[PDB]
Amino acid sequence: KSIEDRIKNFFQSGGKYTELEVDWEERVGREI
Amino acid sequence: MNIKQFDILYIDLNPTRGREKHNVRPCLVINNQMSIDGTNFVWVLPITTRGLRYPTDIQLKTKKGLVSGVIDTVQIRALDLKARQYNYKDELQDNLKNDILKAIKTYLKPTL
Amino acid sequence: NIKQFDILYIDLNPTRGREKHNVRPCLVINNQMSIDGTNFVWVLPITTRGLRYPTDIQLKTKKGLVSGVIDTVQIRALDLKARQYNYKDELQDNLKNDILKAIKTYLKPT
């Protein structure tokens, strides 16, 4: 099965991604 | 407080911790409805108050004319809408929507 | 010297906190023109949590030097002129298309 089908089927069934933001909050240099 | 692809939001971009700074900045949402609803994250490009400088800059045009500036297509970011103050403000004009996505694909397209 | 699908250790908090304490593996996903023209990488996190979602991809690398789970839902653009980084490994060829197809699945209008 294709990964795009698997992702789409996951979300259409009601599957939820529930992670918090990963540990890259800070901005330096030209990041905005 | 519900969000769709190509909405312009003001979003708190500052770190969630050890911060006093809490101003919001305008951002264009570029991920699709399926992933917004499935994850509570938005993928955004920031809107910045300059003129066109860089070849990656796209001039912002909106449906209600409330936000102006340049879309910086380089600085993509996934943000958790449950973790940050955000506010719907405007929407991208329909005629720019394919240009945004084409610009994004340009940066992901692989090479031999 | 950095190319698409390289895995870099990047200092994700260079100015705050303990020295070289948040140095994490990241999968570069933007292409050569983008990296060289902007000096930003687009990265996905390589995490130590287990596989939980169909959006997750188990990392496989050419030298076996980095292990973990690629979370394709979170993406960020990092300025490598301002952050210390080190090339460590690179994605196996057979996973590259899956990575790009997952990303496209978040961008195509619903």
Side-chain angles (χ1 to χ4, degrees), chain B residues 1-11 26-31 33 36 42-45 47 60 62-63 67 86-93 97:
Chain B
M1 288 291 288
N2 284 319
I3 294 316
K4 69 195 182 285
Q5 191 173 32
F6 299 123
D7 287 351
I8 293 91
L9 321 180
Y10 278 75
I11 306 176
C27 299
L28 174 70
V29 173
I30 58 161
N31 58 321
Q33 207 53 54
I36 296 164
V42 285
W43 285 23
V44 305
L45 310 171
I47 290 153
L60 180 65
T62 71
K63 287 180 180 185
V67 180
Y86 70 94
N87 187 0
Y88 172 92
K89 181 63 70 178
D90 208 330
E91 311 185 351
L92 200 67
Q93 295 188 6
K97 290 178 183 183

PDB file of all heavy atoms in Angstrom, chain B residues 1-11 26-31 33 36 42-45 47 60 62-63 67 86-93 97:
ATOM      1  N   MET B   1     -12.698  29.788  15.685  1.00  0.00           N
ATOM      2  CA  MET B   1     -11.252  29.598  15.829  1.00  0.00           C
ATOM      3  C   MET B   1     -10.721  28.435  14.924  1.00  0.00           C
ATOM      4  O   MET B   1      -9.666  27.836  15.203  1.00  0.00           O
ATOM      5  CB  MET B   1     -10.925  29.331  17.306  1.00  0.00           C
ATOM      6  CG  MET B   1     -11.062  30.587  18.201  1.00  0.00           C
ATOM      7  SD  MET B   1      -9.822  31.875  17.912  1.00  0.00           S
ATOM      8  CE  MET B   1      -8.372  31.095  18.622  1.00  0.00           C
ATOM      9  N   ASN B   2     -11.454  28.114  13.852  1.00  0.00           N
ATOM     10  CA  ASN B   2     -11.085  27.030  12.946  1.00  0.00           C
ATOM     11  C   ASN B   2     -10.359  27.614  11.734  1.00  0.00           C
ATOM     12  O   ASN B   2     -10.700  28.705  11.273  1.00  0.00           O
ATOM     13  CB  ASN B   2     -12.317  26.243  12.501  1.00  0.00           C
ATOM     14  CG  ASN B   2     -12.828  25.293  13.603  1.00  0.00           C
ATOM     15  OD1 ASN B   2     -12.050  24.641  14.304  1.00  0.00           O
ATOM     16  ND2 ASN B   2     -14.139  25.227  13.753  1.00  0.00           N
ATOM     17  N   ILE B   3      -9.366  26.874  11.225  1.00  0.00           N
ATOM     18  CA  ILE B   3      -8.333  27.369  10.314  1.00  0.00           C
ATOM     19  C   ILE B   3      -8.360  26.549   9.030  1.00  0.00           C
ATOM     20  O   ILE B   3      -8.603  25.342   9.075  1.00  0.00           O
ATOM     21  CB  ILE B   3      -6.946  27.260  10.994  1.00  0.00           C
ATOM     22  CG1 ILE B   3      -6.915  28.210  12.163  1.00  0.00           C
ATOM     23  CG2 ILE B   3      -5.747  27.535  10.000  1.00  0.00           C
ATOM     24  CD1 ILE B   3      -7.534  29.616  11.804  1.00  0.00           C
ATOM     25  N   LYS B   4      -8.097  27.182   7.880  1.00  0.00           N
ATOM     26  CA  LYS B   4      -8.029  26.421   6.634  1.00  0.00           C
ATOM     27  C   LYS B   4      -6.747  26.750   5.863  1.00  0.00           C
ATOM     28  O   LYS B   4      -6.049  27.727   6.171  1.00  0.00           O
ATOM     29  CB  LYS B   4      -9.313  26.653   5.783  1.00  0.00           C
ATOM     30  CG  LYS B   4      -9.438  28.005   5.217  1.00  0.00           C
ATOM     31  CD  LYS B   4     -10.867  28.280   4.703  1.00  0.00           C
ATOM     32  CE  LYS B   4     -10.938  29.695   4.063  1.00  0.00           C
ATOM     33  NZ  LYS B   4     -10.935  30.814   5.102  1.00  0.00           N
ATOM     34  N   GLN B   5      -6.420  25.887   4.897  1.00  0.00           N
ATOM     35  CA  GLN B   5      -5.289  26.156   4.004  1.00  0.00           C
ATOM     36  C   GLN B   5      -5.421  27.529   3.350  1.00  0.00           C
ATOM     37  O   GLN B   5      -6.501  27.905   2.883  1.00  0.00           O
ATOM     38  CB  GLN B   5      -5.196  25.069   2.938  1.00  0.00           C
ATOM     39  CG  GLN B   5      -3.886  25.115   2.108  1.00  0.00           C
ATOM     40  CD  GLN B   5      -3.798  23.915   1.218  1.00  0.00           C
ATOM     41  OE1 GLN B   5      -4.833  23.416   0.773  1.00  0.00           O
ATOM     42  NE2 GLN B   5      -2.577  23.383   0.999  1.00  0.00           N
ATOM     43  N   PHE B   6      -4.330  28.307   3.396  1.00  0.00           N
ATOM     44  CA  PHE B   6      -4.179  29.609   2.763  1.00  0.00           C
ATOM     45  C   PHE B   6      -4.842  30.724   3.556  1.00  0.00           C
ATOM     46  O   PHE B   6      -4.834  31.871   3.107  1.00  0.00           O
ATOM     47  CB  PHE B   6      -4.679  29.597   1.315  1.00  0.00           C
ATOM     48  CG  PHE B   6      -3.932  28.638   0.439  1.00  0.00           C
ATOM     49  CD1 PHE B   6      -4.604  27.631  -0.252  1.00  0.00           C
ATOM     50  CD2 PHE B   6      -2.554  28.740   0.304  1.00  0.00           C
ATOM     51  CE1 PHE B   6      -3.915  26.744  -1.091  1.00  0.00           C
ATOM     52  CE2 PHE B   6      -1.864  27.860  -0.543  1.00  0.00           C
ATOM     53  CZ  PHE B   6      -2.570  26.856  -1.235  1.00  0.00           C
ATOM     54  N   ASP B   7      -5.311  30.448   4.771  1.00  0.00           N
ATOM     55  CA  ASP B   7      -5.593  31.524   5.714  1.00  0.00           C
ATOM     56  C   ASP B   7      -4.313  32.228   6.140  1.00  0.00           C
ATOM     57  O   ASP B   7      -3.227  31.633   6.204  1.00  0.00           O
ATOM     58  CB  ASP B   7      -6.269  30.986   6.983  1.00  0.00           C
ATOM     59  CG  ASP B   7      -7.714  30.583   6.771  1.00  0.00           C
ATOM     60  OD1 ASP B   7      -8.275  30.863   5.692  1.00  0.00           O
ATOM     61  OD2 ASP B   7      -8.270  29.967   7.709  1.00  0.00           O
ATOM     62  N   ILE B   8      -4.453  33.508   6.448  1.00  0.00           N
ATOM     63  CA  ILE B   8      -3.413  34.306   7.077  1.00  0.00           C
ATOM     64  C   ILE B   8      -3.798  34.481   8.533  1.00  0.00           C
ATOM     65  O   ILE B   8      -4.891  35.005   8.836  1.00  0.00           O
ATOM     66  CB  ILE B   8      -3.210  35.661   6.370  1.00  0.00           C
ATOM     67  CG1 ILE B   8      -2.645  35.475   4.945  1.00  0.00           C
ATOM     68  CG2 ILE B   8      -2.212  36.534   7.097  1.00  0.00           C
ATOM     69  CD1 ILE B   8      -3.599  35.350   3.904  1.00  0.00           C
ATOM     70  N   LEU B   9      -2.915  34.010   9.435  1.00  0.00           N
ATOM     71  CA  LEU B   9      -3.106  34.117  10.882  1.00  0.00           C
ATOM     72  C   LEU B   9      -2.031  34.989  11.478  1.00  0.00           C
ATOM     73  O   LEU B   9      -0.893  35.009  11.004  1.00  0.00           O
ATOM     74  CB  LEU B   9      -3.029  32.754  11.612  1.00  0.00           C
ATOM     75  CG  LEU B   9      -3.634  31.522  10.964  1.00  0.00           C
ATOM     76  CD1 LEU B   9      -3.456  30.311  11.849  1.00  0.00           C
ATOM     77  CD2 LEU B   9      -5.134  31.751  10.680  1.00  0.00           C
ATOM     78  N   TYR B  10      -2.375  35.652  12.573  1.00  0.00           N
ATOM     79  CA  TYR B  10      -1.359  36.203  13.453  1.00  0.00           C
ATOM     80  C   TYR B  10      -1.116  35.156  14.532  1.00  0.00           C
ATOM     81  O   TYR B  10      -2.070  34.700  15.173  1.00  0.00           O
ATOM     82  CB  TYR B  10      -1.813  37.537  14.057  1.00  0.00           C
ATOM     83  CG  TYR B  10      -1.589  38.706  13.117  1.00  0.00           C
ATOM     84  CD1 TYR B  10      -2.410  38.892  12.035  1.00  0.00           C
ATOM     85  CD2 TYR B  10      -0.527  39.591  13.288  1.00  0.00           C
ATOM     86  CE1 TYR B  10      -2.233  39.956  11.170  1.00  0.00           C
ATOM     87  CE2 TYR B  10      -0.335  40.660  12.393  1.00  0.00           C
ATOM     88  CZ  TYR B  10      -1.193  40.829  11.343  1.00  0.00           C
ATOM     89  OH  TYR B  10      -1.048  41.882  10.441  1.00  0.00           O
ATOM     90  N   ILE B  11       0.141  34.762  14.717  1.00  0.00           N
ATOM     91  CA  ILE B  11       0.476  33.615  15.558  1.00  0.00           C
ATOM     92  C   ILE B  11       1.632  34.077  16.398  1.00  0.00           C
ATOM     93  O   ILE B  11       2.523  34.758  15.890  1.00  0.00           O
ATOM     94  CB  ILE B  11       0.947  32.370  14.765  1.00  0.00           C
ATOM     95  CG1 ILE B  11      -0.043  31.976  13.719  1.00  0.00           C
ATOM     96  CG2 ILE B  11       1.065  31.087  15.746  1.00  0.00           C
ATOM     97  CD1 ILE B  11       0.435  30.818  12.865  1.00  0.00           C
ATOM     98  N   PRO B  26       2.159  37.852  11.351  1.00  0.00           N
ATOM     99  CA  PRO B  26       1.312  37.248  10.315  1.00  0.00           C
ATOM    100  C   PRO B  26       2.028  36.099   9.598  1.00  0.00           C
ATOM    101  O   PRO B  26       3.182  36.213   9.211  1.00  0.00           O
ATOM    102  CB  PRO B  26       1.030  38.415   9.353  1.00  0.00           C
ATOM    103  CG  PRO B  26       2.163  39.335   9.525  1.00  0.00           C
ATOM    104  CD  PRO B  26       2.646  39.199  10.954  1.00  0.00           C
ATOM    105  N   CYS B  27       1.291  35.034   9.333  1.00  0.00           N
ATOM    106  CA  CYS B  27       1.832  33.829   8.711  1.00  0.00           C
ATOM    107  C   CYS B  27       0.805  33.309   7.739  1.00  0.00           C
ATOM    108  O   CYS B  27      -0.393  33.416   8.010  1.00  0.00           O
ATOM    109  CB  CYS B  27       2.121  32.741   9.732  1.00  0.00           C
ATOM    110  SG  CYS B  27       3.327  33.218  10.963  1.00  0.00           S
ATOM    111  N   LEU B  28       1.273  32.752   6.613  1.00  0.00           N
ATOM    112  CA  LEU B  28       0.397  32.057   5.675  1.00  0.00           C
ATOM    113  C   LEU B  28       0.397  30.572   5.994  1.00  0.00           C
ATOM    114  O   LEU B  28       1.460  29.948   6.016  1.00  0.00           O
ATOM    115  CB  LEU B  28       0.878  32.291   4.222  1.00  0.00           C
ATOM    116  CG  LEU B  28       0.142  31.501   3.161  1.00  0.00           C
ATOM    117  CD1 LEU B  28      -1.281  32.072   3.047  1.00  0.00           C
ATOM    118  CD2 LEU B  28       0.902  31.653   1.811  1.00  0.00           C
ATOM    119  N   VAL B  29      -0.788  29.988   6.148  1.00  0.00           N
ATOM    120  CA  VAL B  29      -0.933  28.544   6.352  1.00  0.00           C
ATOM    121  C   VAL B  29      -0.879  27.825   5.009  1.00  0.00           C
ATOM    122  O   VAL B  29      -1.660  28.138   4.107  1.00  0.00           O
ATOM    123  CB  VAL B  29      -2.258  28.233   7.063  1.00  0.00           C
ATOM    124  CG1 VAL B  29      -2.502  26.698   7.133  1.00  0.00           C
ATOM    125  CG2 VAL B  29      -2.316  28.924   8.464  1.00  0.00           C
ATOM    126  N   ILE B  30      -0.022  26.805   4.882  1.00  0.00           N
ATOM    127  CA  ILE B  30       0.118  26.110   3.599  1.00  0.00           C
ATOM    128  C   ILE B  30      -0.199  24.628   3.671  1.00  0.00           C
ATOM    129  O   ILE B  30      -0.268  23.979   2.612  1.00  0.00           O
ATOM    130  CB  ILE B  30       1.517  26.329   2.986  1.00  0.00           C
ATOM    131  CG1 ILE B  30       2.599  25.829   3.979  1.00  0.00           C
ATOM    132  CG2 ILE B  30       1.673  27.854   2.702  1.00  0.00           C
ATOM    133  CD1 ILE B  30       3.933  25.564   3.346  1.00  0.00           C
ATOM    134  N   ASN B  31      -0.417  24.041   4.857  1.00  0.00           N
ATOM    135  CA  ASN B  31      -0.794  22.633   4.792  1.00  0.00           C
ATOM    136  C   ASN B  31      -2.290  22.529   4.592  1.00  0.00           C
ATOM    137  O   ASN B  31      -3.052  23.505   4.758  1.00  0.00           O
ATOM    138  CB  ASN B  31      -0.315  21.834   6.023  1.00  0.00           C
ATOM    139  CG  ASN B  31      -0.844  22.372   7.341  1.00  0.00           C
ATOM    140  OD1 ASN B  31      -0.944  23.575   7.537  1.00  0.00           O
ATOM    141  ND2 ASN B  31      -1.152  21.473   8.259  1.00  0.00           N
ATOM    142  N   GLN B  33      -6.320  20.904   4.653  1.00  0.00           N
ATOM    143  CA  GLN B  33      -7.359  20.744   5.670  1.00  0.00           C
ATOM    144  C   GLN B  33      -7.256  19.390   6.354  1.00  0.00           C
ATOM    145  O   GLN B  33      -7.447  19.275   7.577  1.00  0.00           O
ATOM    146  CB  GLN B  33      -8.753  20.895   5.025  1.00  0.00           C
ATOM    147  CG  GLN B  33      -9.799  21.395   5.999  1.00  0.00           C
ATOM    148  CD  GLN B  33      -9.348  22.661   6.684  1.00  0.00           C
ATOM    149  OE1 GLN B  33      -9.000  23.614   6.008  1.00  0.00           O
ATOM    150  NE2 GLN B  33      -9.333  22.683   8.038  1.00  0.00           N
ATOM    151  N   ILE B  36      -4.333  19.775   8.883  1.00  0.00           N
ATOM    152  CA  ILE B  36      -4.721  20.674   9.969  1.00  0.00           C
ATOM    153  C   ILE B  36      -5.658  19.967  10.949  1.00  0.00           C
ATOM    154  O   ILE B  36      -5.437  19.985  12.164  1.00  0.00           O
ATOM    155  CB  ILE B  36      -5.380  21.953   9.429  1.00  0.00           C
ATOM    156  CG1 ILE B  36      -4.390  22.758   8.584  1.00  0.00           C
ATOM    157  CG2 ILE B  36      -5.906  22.801  10.660  1.00  0.00           C
ATOM    158  CD1 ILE B  36      -5.059  23.813   7.698  1.00  0.00           C
ATOM    159  N   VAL B  42      -0.218  23.751  12.082  1.00  0.00           N
ATOM    160  CA  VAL B  42      -0.153  24.444  10.797  1.00  0.00           C
ATOM    161  C   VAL B  42       1.300  24.468  10.351  1.00  0.00           C
ATOM    162  O   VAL B  42       2.225  24.652  11.167  1.00  0.00           O
ATOM    163  CB  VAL B  42      -0.702  25.885  10.845  1.00  0.00           C
ATOM    164  CG1 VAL B  42      -2.235  25.861  10.911  1.00  0.00           C
ATOM    165  CG2 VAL B  42      -0.124  26.678  12.058  1.00  0.00           C
ATOM    166  N   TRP B  43       1.483  24.292   9.043  1.00  0.00           N
ATOM    167  CA  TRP B  43       2.717  24.627   8.371  1.00  0.00           C
ATOM    168  C   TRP B  43       2.564  26.042   7.849  1.00  0.00           C
ATOM    169  O   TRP B  43       1.605  26.329   7.142  1.00  0.00           O
ATOM    170  CB  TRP B  43       2.936  23.645   7.210  1.00  0.00           C
ATOM    171  CG  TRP B  43       3.382  22.281   7.637  1.00  0.00           C
ATOM    172  CD1 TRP B  43       3.202  21.672   8.854  1.00  0.00           C
ATOM    173  CD2 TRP B  43       4.098  21.354   6.818  1.00  0.00           C
ATOM    174  NE1 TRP B  43       3.761  20.397   8.831  1.00  0.00           N
ATOM    175  CE2 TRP B  43       4.309  20.183   7.592  1.00  0.00           C
ATOM    176  CE3 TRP B  43       4.571  21.400   5.492  1.00  0.00           C
ATOM    177  CZ2 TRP B  43       5.034  19.072   7.109  1.00  0.00           C
ATOM    178  CZ3 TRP B  43       5.286  20.266   4.994  1.00  0.00           C
ATOM    179  CH2 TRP B  43       5.503  19.134   5.807  1.00  0.00           C
ATOM    180  N   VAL B  44       3.483  26.929   8.189  1.00  0.00           N
ATOM    181  CA  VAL B  44       3.284  28.307   7.790  1.00  0.00           C
ATOM    182  C   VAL B  44       4.526  28.821   7.086  1.00  0.00           C
ATOM    183  O   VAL B  44       5.642  28.343   7.307  1.00  0.00           O
ATOM    184  CB  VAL B  44       2.931  29.249   8.998  1.00  0.00           C
ATOM    185  CG1 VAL B  44       1.762  28.740   9.718  1.00  0.00           C
ATOM    186  CG2 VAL B  44       4.079  29.381   9.969  1.00  0.00           C
ATOM    187  N   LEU B  45       4.319  29.834   6.257  1.00  0.00           N
ATOM    188  CA  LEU B  45       5.402  30.703   5.765  1.00  0.00           C
ATOM    189  C   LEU B  45       5.211  32.078   6.376  1.00  0.00           C
ATOM    190  O   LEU B  45       4.103  32.613   6.326  1.00  0.00           O
ATOM    191  CB  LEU B  45       5.371  30.835   4.216  1.00  0.00           C
ATOM    192  CG  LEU B  45       5.284  29.496   3.470  1.00  0.00           C
ATOM    193  CD1 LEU B  45       5.026  29.740   1.953  1.00  0.00           C
ATOM    194  CD2 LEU B  45       6.592  28.639   3.695  1.00  0.00           C
ATOM    195  N   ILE B  47       5.130  36.150   6.985  1.00  0.00           N
ATOM    196  CA  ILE B  47       4.926  37.343   6.173  1.00  0.00           C
ATOM    197  C   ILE B  47       5.745  38.453   6.818  1.00  0.00           C
ATOM    198  O   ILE B  47       5.720  38.634   8.036  1.00  0.00           O
ATOM    199  CB  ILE B  47       3.423  37.693   6.074  1.00  0.00           C
ATOM    200  CG1 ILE B  47       2.709  36.634   5.207  1.00  0.00           C
ATOM    201  CG2 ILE B  47       3.212  39.119   5.564  1.00  0.00           C
ATOM    202  CD1 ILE B  47       1.231  36.471   5.550  1.00  0.00           C
ATOM    203  N   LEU B  60       2.567  39.398  -1.043  1.00  0.00           N
ATOM    204  CA  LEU B  60       1.294  38.978  -0.481  1.00  0.00           C
ATOM    205  C   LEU B  60       0.139  39.728  -1.145  1.00  0.00           C
ATOM    206  O   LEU B  60       0.161  40.959  -1.245  1.00  0.00           O
ATOM    207  CB  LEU B  60       1.288  39.242   1.024  1.00  0.00           C
ATOM    208  CG  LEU B  60      -0.027  38.833   1.689  1.00  0.00           C
ATOM    209  CD1 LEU B  60      -0.284  37.303   1.625  1.00  0.00           C
ATOM    210  CD2 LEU B  60      -0.034  39.346   3.127  1.00  0.00           C
ATOM    211  N   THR B  62      -4.182  39.477  -0.534  1.00  0.00           N
ATOM    212  CA  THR B  62      -5.259  38.888   0.248  1.00  0.00           C
ATOM    213  C   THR B  62      -6.647  39.299  -0.253  1.00  0.00           C
ATOM    214  O   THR B  62      -6.828  40.276  -0.989  1.00  0.00           O
ATOM    215  CB  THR B  62      -5.145  39.300   1.723  1.00  0.00           C
ATOM    216  OG1 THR B  62      -5.467  40.686   1.843  1.00  0.00           O
ATOM    217  CG2 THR B  62      -3.695  39.087   2.268  1.00  0.00           C
ATOM    218  N   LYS B  63      -7.643  38.535   0.186  1.00  0.00           N
ATOM    219  CA  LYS B  63      -8.997  38.788  -0.272  1.00  0.00           C
ATOM    220  C   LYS B  63      -9.587  40.028   0.373  1.00  0.00           C
ATOM    221  O   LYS B  63     -10.372  40.731  -0.269  1.00  0.00           O
ATOM    222  CB  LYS B  63      -9.868  37.578   0.004  1.00  0.00           C
ATOM    223  CG  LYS B  63      -9.529  36.462  -0.931  1.00  0.00           C
ATOM    224  CD  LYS B  63     -10.383  35.239  -0.675  1.00  0.00           C
ATOM    225  CE  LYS B  63     -10.005  34.155  -1.633  1.00  0.00           C
ATOM    226  NZ  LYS B  63     -10.917  33.018  -1.464  1.00  0.00           N
ATOM    227  N   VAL B  67      -3.823  42.477   5.355  1.00  0.00           N
ATOM    228  CA  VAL B  67      -2.435  42.207   5.679  1.00  0.00           C
ATOM    229  C   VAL B  67      -1.627  42.458   4.423  1.00  0.00           C
ATOM    230  O   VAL B  67      -2.026  42.024   3.343  1.00  0.00           O
ATOM    231  CB  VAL B  67      -2.238  40.749   6.142  1.00  0.00           C
ATOM    232  CG1 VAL B  67      -0.719  40.507   6.489  1.00  0.00           C
ATOM    233  CG2 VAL B  67      -3.180  40.421   7.319  1.00  0.00           C
ATOM    234  N   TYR B  86      -3.199  32.333  18.518  1.00  0.00           N
ATOM    235  CA  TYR B  86      -3.336  32.658  17.099  1.00  0.00           C
ATOM    236  C   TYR B  86      -4.706  33.270  16.847  1.00  0.00           C
ATOM    237  O   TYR B  86      -5.656  33.066  17.611  1.00  0.00           O
ATOM    238  CB  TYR B  86      -3.161  31.421  16.221  1.00  0.00           C
ATOM    239  CG  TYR B  86      -4.316  30.449  16.363  1.00  0.00           C
ATOM    240  CD1 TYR B  86      -5.411  30.484  15.486  1.00  0.00           C
ATOM    241  CD2 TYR B  86      -4.323  29.503  17.396  1.00  0.00           C
ATOM    242  CE1 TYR B  86      -6.488  29.575  15.634  1.00  0.00           C
ATOM    243  CE2 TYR B  86      -5.390  28.600  17.555  1.00  0.00           C
ATOM    244  CZ  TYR B  86      -6.464  28.647  16.668  1.00  0.00           C
ATOM    245  OH  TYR B  86      -7.512  27.750  16.820  1.00  0.00           O
ATOM    246  N   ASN B  87      -4.800  33.980  15.730  1.00  0.00           N
ATOM    247  CA  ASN B  87      -5.964  34.763  15.329  1.00  0.00           C
ATOM    248  C   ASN B  87      -6.059  34.735  13.812  1.00  0.00           C
ATOM    249  O   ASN B  87      -5.183  35.321  13.179  1.00  0.00           O
ATOM    250  CB  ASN B  87      -5.762  36.238  15.794  1.00  0.00           C
ATOM    251  CG  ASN B  87      -6.966  37.077  15.578  1.00  0.00           C
ATOM    252  OD1 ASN B  87      -7.973  36.582  15.086  1.00  0.00           O
ATOM    253  ND2 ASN B  87      -6.801  38.411  15.706  1.00  0.00           N
ATOM    254  N   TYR B  88      -7.137  34.186  13.242  1.00  0.00           N
ATOM    255  CA  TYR B  88      -7.470  34.407  11.832  1.00  0.00           C
ATOM    256  C   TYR B  88      -7.572  35.890  11.497  1.00  0.00           C
ATOM    257  O   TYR B  88      -8.169  36.672  12.243  1.00  0.00           O
ATOM    258  CB  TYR B  88      -8.786  33.709  11.470  1.00  0.00           C
ATOM    259  CG  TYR B  88      -9.259  34.069  10.070  1.00  0.00           C
ATOM    260  CD1 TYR B  88      -8.898  33.283   8.973  1.00  0.00           C
ATOM    261  CD2 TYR B  88     -10.035  35.214   9.836  1.00  0.00           C
ATOM    262  CE1 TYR B  88      -9.313  33.616   7.649  1.00  0.00           C
ATOM    263  CE2 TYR B  88     -10.438  35.566   8.533  1.00  0.00           C
ATOM    264  CZ  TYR B  88     -10.093  34.750   7.452  1.00  0.00           C
ATOM    265  OH  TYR B  88     -10.482  35.112   6.179  1.00  0.00           O
ATOM    266  N   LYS B  89      -6.954  36.304  10.352  1.00  0.00           N
ATOM    267  CA  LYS B  89      -7.082  37.706   9.940  1.00  0.00           C
ATOM    268  C   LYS B  89      -7.520  37.881   8.494  1.00  0.00           C
ATOM    269  O   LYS B  89      -8.400  38.697   8.241  1.00  0.00           O
ATOM    270  CB  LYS B  89      -5.790  38.504  10.213  1.00  0.00           C
ATOM    271  CG  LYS B  89      -5.816  40.018   9.825  1.00  0.00           C
ATOM    272  CD  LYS B  89      -6.820  40.994  10.544  1.00  0.00           C
ATOM    273  CE  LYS B  89      -6.532  41.298  11.992  1.00  0.00           C
ATOM    274  NZ  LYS B  89      -7.524  42.279  12.561  1.00  0.00           N
ATOM    275  N   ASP B  90      -7.011  37.086   7.563  1.00  0.00           N
ATOM    276  CA  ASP B  90      -7.352  37.259   6.150  1.00  0.00           C
ATOM    277  C   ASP B  90      -7.119  35.929   5.444  1.00  0.00           C
ATOM    278  O   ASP B  90      -6.858  34.903   6.090  1.00  0.00           O
ATOM    279  CB  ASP B  90      -6.526  38.403   5.571  1.00  0.00           C
ATOM    280  CG  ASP B  90      -7.224  39.120   4.375  1.00  0.00           C
ATOM    281  OD1 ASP B  90      -8.001  38.498   3.618  1.00  0.00           O
ATOM    282  OD2 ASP B  90      -6.907  40.294   4.170  1.00  0.00           O
ATOM    283  N   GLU B  91      -7.207  35.947   4.112  1.00  0.00           N
ATOM    284  CA  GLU B  91      -7.041  34.774   3.256  1.00  0.00           C
ATOM    285  C   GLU B  91      -6.285  35.173   2.006  1.00  0.00           C
ATOM    286  O   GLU B  91      -6.506  36.265   1.484  1.00  0.00           O
ATOM    287  CB  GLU B  91      -8.355  34.174   2.745  1.00  0.00           C
ATOM    288  CG  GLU B  91      -9.352  33.948   3.775  1.00  0.00           C
ATOM    289  CD  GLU B  91     -10.556  33.259   3.237  1.00  0.00           C
ATOM    290  OE1 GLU B  91     -10.667  33.105   2.001  1.00  0.00           O
ATOM    291  OE2 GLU B  91     -11.351  32.804   4.076  1.00  0.00           O
ATOM    292  N   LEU B  92      -5.427  34.270   1.521  1.00  0.00           N
ATOM    293  CA  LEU B  92      -4.738  34.457   0.250  1.00  0.00           C
ATOM    294  C   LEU B  92      -5.734  34.554  -0.902  1.00  0.00           C
ATOM    295  O   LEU B  92      -6.660  33.739  -1.017  1.00  0.00           O
ATOM    296  CB  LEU B  92      -3.791  33.270   0.004  1.00  0.00           C
ATOM    297  CG  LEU B  92      -2.669  33.531  -0.995  1.00  0.00           C
ATOM    298  CD1 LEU B  92      -1.707  34.541  -0.441  1.00  0.00           C
ATOM    299  CD2 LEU B  92      -1.932  32.231  -1.342  1.00  0.00           C
ATOM    300  N   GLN B  93      -5.494  35.494  -1.817  1.00  0.00           N
ATOM    301  CA  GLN B  93      -6.243  35.485  -3.081  1.00  0.00           C
ATOM    302  C   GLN B  93      -6.088  34.157  -3.808  1.00  0.00           C
ATOM    303  O   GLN B  93      -4.995  33.564  -3.841  1.00  0.00           O
ATOM    304  CB  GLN B  93      -5.770  36.624  -3.991  1.00  0.00           C
ATOM    305  CG  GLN B  93      -6.076  38.016  -3.426  1.00  0.00           C
ATOM    306  CD  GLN B  93      -5.776  39.156  -4.435  1.00  0.00           C
ATOM    307  OE1 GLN B  93      -5.441  38.902  -5.593  1.00  0.00           O
ATOM    308  NE2 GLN B  93      -5.826  40.401  -3.960  1.00  0.00           N
ATOM    309  N   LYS B  97      -2.625  30.861  -5.010  1.00  0.00           N
ATOM    310  CA  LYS B  97      -2.548  29.576  -4.318  1.00  0.00           C
ATOM    311  C   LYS B  97      -1.638  28.569  -5.041  1.00  0.00           C
ATOM    312  O   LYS B  97      -0.759  27.963  -4.411  1.00  0.00           O
ATOM    313  CB  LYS B  97      -3.962  29.016  -4.120  1.00  0.00           C
ATOM    314  CG  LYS B  97      -4.755  29.827  -3.080  1.00  0.00           C
ATOM    315  CD  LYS B  97      -6.155  29.308  -2.937  1.00  0.00           C
ATOM    316  CE  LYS B  97      -6.949  30.189  -1.956  1.00  0.00           C
ATOM    317  NZ  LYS B  97      -8.286  29.575  -1.800  1.00  0.00           N
TER     318      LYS B  97
END
